[PDB]
């Protein structure tokens, strides 16, 4: 309809925005500083 | 709880604020100015 916003714009009159590109920004999360232990064991309660 | 302040803070919104670290500041306590005497004997009384 109208309002409405394209993005190709292929040999036809029109305005259209590409997506927002965002790839110079490319950082990481894996948050190095964290630390947790796992082990094995008998208790008395829990699921087995 | 609440009131209670954490100090990873890892990936995830919150506030938490490190130990303090107070490794700068280390001193050593060994009062140089100090001398005790050590002996063997015999005597009349005490713990042989």
């Given at each position: 309809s109208q309002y409405s916003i394209q993005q190709s714009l292929g040999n036809a009159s029109g305005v259209a925005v590409s997506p927002i590109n965002a790839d110079a920004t490319l950082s990481t999360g894996v948050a190095l500083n964290s630390?947790?232990?796992a082990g094995i064991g008998v208790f008395?309660?829990?699921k087995p």
């Open positions: 630390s947790l232990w008395a309660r829990g």
